[PDB]
Structures are given as structure tokens and as C-alpha cells.
Write a protein that holds these residues in place. Structure first.
Motif, PDB file in Angstrom:
ATOM      1  N   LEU A  33      35.531  53.302  27.068  1.00 51.15           N
ATOM      2  CA  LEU A  33      36.497  54.393  26.901  1.00 51.15           C
ATOM      3  C   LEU A  33      35.785  55.739  26.884  1.00 51.15           C
ATOM      4  O   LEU A  33      34.695  55.846  26.375  1.00 51.15           O
ATOM      5  CB  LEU A  33      37.229  54.120  25.586  1.00 51.15           C
ATOM      6  N   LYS A  70      45.690  46.815  17.985  1.00 54.38           N
ATOM      7  CA  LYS A  70      45.593  45.621  18.815  1.00 54.38           C
ATOM      8  C   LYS A  70      46.044  44.391  18.023  1.00 54.38           C
ATOM      9  O   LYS A  70      45.454  44.040  17.008  1.00 54.38           O
ATOM     10  CB  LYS A  70      44.191  45.419  19.332  1.00 54.38           C
ATOM     11  N   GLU A 120      53.722  52.888  20.553  1.00 57.42           N
ATOM     12  CA  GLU A 120      53.928  52.674  21.981  1.00 57.42           C
ATOM     13  C   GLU A 120      52.953  51.705  22.654  1.00 57.42           C
ATOM     14  O   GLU A 120      51.780  51.742  22.378  1.00 57.42           O
ATOM     15  CB  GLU A 120      53.842  54.007  22.705  1.00 57.42           C
ATOM     16  N   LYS A 165      40.249  53.321  34.968  1.00 56.58           N
ATOM     17  CA  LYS A 165      41.141  54.401  35.390  1.00 56.58           C
ATOM     18  C   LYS A 165      40.378  55.610  35.926  1.00 56.58           C
ATOM     19  O   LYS A 165      40.756  56.207  36.935  1.00 56.58           O
ATOM     20  CB  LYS A 165      42.079  54.786  34.240  1.00 56.58           C
ATOM     21  N   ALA A 182      44.553  53.191  18.008  1.00 58.37           N
ATOM     22  CA  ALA A 182      44.911  52.050  18.847  1.00 58.37           C
ATOM     23  C   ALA A 182      45.095  50.832  17.959  1.00 58.37           C
ATOM     24  O   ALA A 182      44.237  50.532  17.147  1.00 58.37           O
ATOM     25  CB  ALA A 182      43.873  51.775  19.900  1.00 58.37           C
ATOM     26  N   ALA A 191      34.303  49.361  23.645  1.00 59.40           N
ATOM     27  CA  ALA A 191      35.394  48.799  22.837  1.00 59.40           C
ATOM     28  C   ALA A 191      35.271  47.275  22.836  1.00 59.40           C
ATOM     29  O   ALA A 191      34.790  46.698  23.814  1.00 59.40           O
ATOM     30  CB  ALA A 191      36.716  49.187  23.373  1.00 59.40           C
ATOM     31  N   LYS A 246      49.452  52.332  21.086  1.00 59.72           N
ATOM     32  CA  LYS A 246      49.113  53.608  20.499  1.00 59.72           C
ATOM     33  C   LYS A 246      50.064  53.788  19.336  1.00 59.72           C
ATOM     34  O   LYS A 246      51.272  53.551  19.493  1.00 59.72           O
ATOM     35  CB  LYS A 246      49.293  54.722  21.528  1.00 59.72           C
ATOM     36  N   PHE A 259      41.216  55.901  18.669  1.00 64.94           N
ATOM     37  CA  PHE A 259      41.956  56.011  19.903  1.00 64.94           C
ATOM     38  C   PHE A 259      41.217  56.960  20.849  1.00 64.94           C
ATOM     39  O   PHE A 259      40.813  58.062  20.492  1.00 64.94           O
ATOM     40  CB  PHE A 259      43.346  56.650  19.698  1.00 64.94           C
ATOM     41  N   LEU A 260      41.006  56.524  22.086  1.00 65.07           N
ATOM     42  CA  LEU A 260      40.519  57.365  23.166  1.00 65.07           C
ATOM     43  C   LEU A 260      41.502  57.300  24.301  1.00 65.07           C
ATOM     44  O   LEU A 260      42.160  56.284  24.548  1.00 65.07           O
ATOM     45  CB  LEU A 260      39.135  56.891  23.633  1.00 65.07           C
ATOM     46  N   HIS A 261      41.517  58.354  25.103  1.00 62.53           N
ATOM     47  CA  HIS A 261      42.612  58.640  26.002  1.00 62.53           C
ATOM     48  C   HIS A 261      42.472  58.020  27.392  1.00 62.53           C
ATOM     49  O   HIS A 261      43.429  58.051  28.154  1.00 62.53           O
ATOM     50  CB  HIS A 261      42.752  60.158  26.135  1.00 62.53           C
ATOM     51  N   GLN A 262      41.276  57.543  27.762  1.00 57.52           N
ATOM     52  CA  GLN A 262      41.122  57.016  29.105  1.00 57.52           C
ATOM     53  C   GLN A 262      40.019  55.961  29.106  1.00 57.52           C
ATOM     54  O   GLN A 262      39.128  55.989  28.283  1.00 57.52           O
ATOM     55  CB  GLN A 262      40.740  58.159  30.019  1.00 57.52           C
ATOM     56  N   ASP A 263      40.121  55.035  30.061  1.00 59.66           N
ATOM     57  CA  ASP A 263      39.086  54.019  30.269  1.00 59.66           C
ATOM     58  C   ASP A 263      38.358  54.297  31.569  1.00 59.66           C
ATOM     59  O   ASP A 263      38.774  55.095  32.417  1.00 59.66           O
ATOM     60  CB  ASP A 263      39.593  52.591  30.187  1.00 59.66           C
ATOM     61  N   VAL A 313      33.411  52.201  19.892  1.00 58.56           N
ATOM     62  CA  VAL A 313      34.754  52.508  19.422  1.00 58.56           C
ATOM     63  C   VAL A 313      34.896  52.038  17.981  1.00 58.56           C
ATOM     64  O   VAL A 313      34.741  50.873  17.677  1.00 58.56           O
ATOM     65  CB  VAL A 313      35.874  51.932  20.329  1.00 58.56           C
TER      66      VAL A 313
END
Ligand SMILES: Cn1cc(NC(=O)c2cc(-c3ccccc3)nc3ccnn23)cn1
Length: 291
Positions: free
Chosen positions: A127, A33, A8, A82, A31, A137, A20, A75-79, A57
């Protein structure tokens, strides 16, 4: 992209889409890229697989297949961008600001000790997770791929965190550029507003000058010989940090002042910053994260 099931789009990063994805063999969520476009870059990036630290990261793999370059990250869920937007009514609590700054400085000290720079720190590449950690990251990538003016999808790459020696055309970066960026981020966490939100290179430079004073040979020996220095720059007086980052205490303001020295040789190092009195009472609080 068949030895990843489920893929996704997360966002659009500096070099290409970020997804993701789930690794097929292992089940792990990562993640991924895509770097949009060189063999010198491949070895350089590959070296970063060894650059492992709890505040960095993790780079899991460098996939060079089918003449394409993909980087696989933890993978981490938030930055932090945000999180600060989500935290805007109340602000991030000072103990959590302090924890995050302390952790970010540990990450910088590690990478700098290994001669690796970031050069494009910003809230979007910081992150966070549920356990109170924050991680940096995209370390080391700028030395490999450059920093563009616009991304692959035409989004403007932010100037807000750029050090003044970069804006004045110094062609050899040092670790000080990362300290400057982090100082900018520190101020933004405290005030809940970007410190220097320029929308062009000269706007960025003059926003710096109107807060910190136009630099001169007294505070920055050599400045007037910089490639893009012009003697016609307006001469603004320096503002007090008590006006720029209230309600930060005198320890925090002292540290911030040292992270935002004009002369990159005067700017505090990450390792030195960890010993600053501001961190005497540091702790590791749990953030309130809604995922
Ligand atoms: C290198 N690296 C990047 C990441 N993760 C992120 O970029 C990332 C992913 C997501 C996300 C949101 C909804 C669905 C799926 C993913 N949301 C955020 C919010 C902030 N970041 N972020 C992990 N490792």
C-alpha cells in the motif's frame, strides 16, 4: 459494528471482506478485515500488534467478539496493483521504483529480524500513500490462517509471486520466499508486465523454468529430492536478464538475479540487498496519486 460508524466495502481480501470504516470513539478511518473461519491463531495474530515499522501496515487491534475475528489496520488509500495499472502508459519512474524497492526491503528486513514471514506478497498487499511511502500489509497472517486456493467469494488466489521451493512442495518456509516474491514485483514494476503469470501450479513452475532454466543439482543442491519434483520435467535453458527486464541497468539486473536464485540458501537476504550498489543513489520521490 456500531462502535464503527460509516462502513464501506473496499474489496474482497484473502480471508474475507475488507471495509473502510470510522472508529466511533476516536473518529479515525481504518481498514477493517473480517477473517472468515481457532485459539492458536488468536495469540499468534495478537503478537503482530507489537510488530511496528514505518514500512509495515499497522495492526491497530485484533477484535475477537461475538465469536468473530476482525483485524483493524491503518488505512492507506491505494495499492501498488492499482498504481501500476494507473502508471501503465509511462511506467513508474526508475527513482520511484528504486525508492519503493528499498522501502519494501527495509520492511522485510525488520520482520525477518523478528522471525516473522509474509509468504504471500503481491502488489495488492503493498500500500502507498501521498508522501512517497510504501507499506507491506498482511505480514504474519499466513503462518496463522493458511493460504487458500480460492477466497471466500471464489476469486482465485494468485500464484504469480510464489517461490519455487513452495511450488516443489518444501514444507518449511524460510524468509527467502519473501525475497523471491519481491523480486517478481520489482521486475513487474520495471517491465509493466507480470514476470511469471501462471494460471496453475505447473504453469507457474514451467514459466519460472522457461525463464531461469530448469533447476538441477548444480544450481540447487537437493532440488531433485523435493516432494513434487519430477525427473520428467522438461529441461529448458536459462534466459539472460538483459532480455527479461530491459531497460533495467546492470546494478538492477544483478540485484534481481540475486533475489531470484533458485536455491533459497543462495538467495540474497533483505538486509544484504539494502547494501547492494543499486541503492547507492536511492531517493524518496513523491508519486502522482489521484485519489
Ligand atoms: C490493510 N489496509 C488496507 C488498506 N486500504 C485498502 O486496501 C484500499 C482501500 C481503497 C478504497 C477505495 C475507495 C473507497 C474506499 C477505499 N482503495 C484501495 C486501493 C488499494 N488499496 N485500497 C489500508 N490498510
Amino acid at each position: 459494528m456500531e462502535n464503527f460508524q460509516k462502513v464501506e466495502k473496499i474489496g474482497e481480501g484473502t480471508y474475507g471482506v475488507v471495509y473502510k470504516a470510522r472508529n466511533k470513539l476516536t473518529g479515525e478511518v481504518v481498514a477493517l478485515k473480517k477473517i472468515r473461519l481457532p485459539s492458536t491463531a488468536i495469540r499468534e495474530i495478537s503478537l503482530l500488534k507489537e510488530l511496528n515499522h514505518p514500512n509495515i501496515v499497522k495492526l491497530l487491534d485484533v477484535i475477537h467478539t461475538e465469536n468473530k475475528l476482525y483485524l483493524v489496520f491503518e488505512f492507506l488509500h491505494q495499492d501498488l496493483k492499482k498504481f501500476m495499472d494507473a502508471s501503465a502508459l509511462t511506467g513508474i519512474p526508475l527513482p520511484l521504483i528504486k525508492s519503493y524497492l528499498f522501502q519494501l526491503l527495509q520492511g522485510l528486513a525488520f520482520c525477518h529480524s523478528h522471525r516473522v514471514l509474509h509468504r504471500d506478497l503481491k502488489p495488492q498487499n503493498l500500500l502507498i500513500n501521498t508522501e512517497g511511502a510504501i507499506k507491506l500489509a498482511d505480514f504474519g497472517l499466513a503462518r496463522a490462517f493458511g493460504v487458500p486456493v480460492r477466497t471466500y467469494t471464489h476469486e482465485v488466489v494468485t500464484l504469480w509471486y510464489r517461490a519455487p521451493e513452495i511450488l516443489l512442495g518444501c514444507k518449511y518456509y524460510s524468509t527467502a520466499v519473501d525475497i523471491w516474491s519481491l523480486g517478481c514485483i520489482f521486475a513487474e514494476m520495471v517491465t509493466r508486465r507480470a514476470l511469471f503469470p501462471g494460471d496453475s501450479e505447473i504453469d507457474q513452475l514451467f514459466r519460472i523454468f522457461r525463464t531461469l532454466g530448469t533447476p538441477d543439482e548444480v544450481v540447487w543442491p537437493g532440488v531433485t529430492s523435493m516432494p513434487d519434483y519430477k525427473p520428467s520435467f522438461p529441461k529448458w535453458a536459462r534466459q539472460d536478464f538483459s532480455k527479461v527486464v530491459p531497460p533495467l541497468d546492470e546494478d538492477g539486473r544483478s540485484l534481481l538475479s540475486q533475489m531470484l536464485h533458485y536455491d533459497p540458501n543462495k538467495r540474497i537476504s533483505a538486509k544484504a540487498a539494502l547494501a547492494h550498489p543499486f541503492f547507492q543513489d536511492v531517493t524518496k520521490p513523491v508519486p502522482h496519486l489521484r485519489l
